[PDB]
Amino acid sequence: VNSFSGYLKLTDNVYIKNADIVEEAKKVKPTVVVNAANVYLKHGGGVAGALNKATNNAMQVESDDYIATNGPLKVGGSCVLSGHNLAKHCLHVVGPNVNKGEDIQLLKSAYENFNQHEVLLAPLLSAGIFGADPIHSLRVCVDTVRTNVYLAVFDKNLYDKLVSSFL
């Protein structure tokens, strides 16, 4: 039993809710919140901008030190950093950004990072300003992630479309 509330069950291990991931993280304080990161960990907008703003820019400060030491992530890759006031840990995962021409096949590699964590609160990778089709993102999630994932979808209209079209 866990503290996630109000989710629709899509499969054995995938759950979905119309929610603001920032507000959901603040309420649940999950072990892991996933950030929709880029390779530079520049958290300017979308989910990343919202999560970083909620940490009062502490996420960005920590991320800048990470990059200065380690260099950029790979598209499809991830790193574990602090969750600050939102979660124990933040798993920064880089899905491909269609608006940069990155290969959508890398979306499966991106979701594979979730399998290193037993339970996660996450957004749909490569959705929103990353330019991929969220219906496709949900399908890849369900077909790739085997650990327990709680998906937060900000947009109510999109949430309803994702549920209604789910096979």
Which residues would be at the binding site for ligand WYG (CB under 6 A)? Answer: 20-22, 46-47, 50, 123, 127-129, 153-155, 158
User: Can you name the residues that pair with 34 across neighbouring β-strands?
Assistant: 91
* Residue placing its CB nearer to ligand WYG in the complex, 79 or 153: 153
Q: Give me the least distance between CB of 50 and ligand WYG, in Å please.
A: 4
Element (H, E) at 29: none
Q: Give me the least distance between CB of 47 and ligand WYG, in Å please.
A: 5
Q: Give me the least distance between CB of 21 and ligand WYG, in Å please.
A: 5
Q: Give me the least distance between CB of 153 and ligand WYG, in Å please.
A: 4
Query: Position 67: which residue type?
Result: I
Q: Give me the least distance between CB of 129 and ligand WYG, in Å please.
A: 6
Contact 32, 119 (CB under 8 A): yes
Helices (H), 29-70: 46-54, 58-70
* Residue placing its CB nearer to ligand WYG in the complex, 80 or 158: 158
39 CB-side CA count, 13 A: 10
* Residue placing its CB nearer to ligand WYG in the complex, 69 or 157: 157
* Residue placing its CB nearer to ligand WYG in the complex, 70 or 100: 100
Strand-pair category, 32-36 with 78-82: unpaired
Q: Which residue matches tokens 């327990």?
A: 148
* Residue placing its CB nearer to ligand WYG in the complex, 46 or 71: 46
- Of 78, 96, 74, 88, nearest to 33 (Cα)? 88
